[PDB]
């Protein structure tokens, strides 16, 4: 158990190092909003005494980050808690931690390259190799080695779905 939380800490520290070295500014944006945004989710509601109004716990920092880019801060990131008032299951908790970053003058192609580099690099640094064993159904089920060796496979949603369905979708 200790070892899992050490790994978790190493993941976060790795990401900060990666983003810092690329010139990103670590920022903190409001966790309480007049209007929650930046994602699709049910928000938490609370009452603020000083302003005598209800506020919503953030579901994502996205809109604040983009306003700061407008502000002229070209590269920003935030690793912090988000709150979504939905279901609890094996991959969902109402409060969870995310990293978001925003990069002026980049497009999605750039971010795929950066994502491959960060994630593969992280996995190799932390585990010693690109291949990780995982039990998707727990120790009573089968395990699989997951290969983080870059580049990652790419598929186009509509294209691949149409192929898997054996039919064309309406535009």
């Amino acid at each position: 158990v200790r070892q899992k939380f050490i790994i978790r800490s190493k993941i976060i520290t790795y990401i900060r190092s990666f983003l810092d070295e690329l010139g990103f500014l670590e920022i903190e944006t409001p966790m309480m909003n007049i209007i929650p945004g930046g994602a699709v989710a049910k928000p938490f509601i609370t009452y603020h005494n000083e302003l005598d109004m209800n506020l919503y716990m953030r579901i994502a920092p996205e809109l604040y980050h983009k306003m700061l880019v407008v502000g002229g801060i070209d590269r920003v990131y935030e690793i912090g808690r988000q709150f979504r008032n939905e279901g609890i299951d094996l991959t969902h908790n109402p409060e969870f931690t995310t990293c978001e970053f925003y990069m002026a003058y980049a497009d999605y192609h750039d971010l795929m390259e950066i994502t491959e580099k960060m994630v593969s690099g992280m996995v190799k640094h932390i585990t010693g190799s690109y291949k990780v064993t995982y039990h998707p159904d727990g120790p009573e089920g089968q395990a699989y080695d997951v290969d983080f060796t870059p580049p990652f496979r790419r598929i186009n949603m509509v294209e691949e779905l149409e192929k898997a369905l054996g039919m064309k979708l309406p535009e």
Binding site: D20, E21, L22, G23, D74, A106, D110
Partner: protein, 31 residues
């Protein structure tokens, strides 16, 4: 001088090919 014939590249402007590119970097503020 022999009569003028425009170059086959059109004559508008010198060929300017699209070249490979590399996302610029900003320095670590902490460094």
């Amino acid at each position: 001088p022999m009569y003028q014939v425009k170059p086959y590249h059109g004559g508008g402007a010198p060929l300017r090919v699209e070249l490979p590119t590399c996302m610029y970097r900003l320095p670590n503020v902490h460094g």
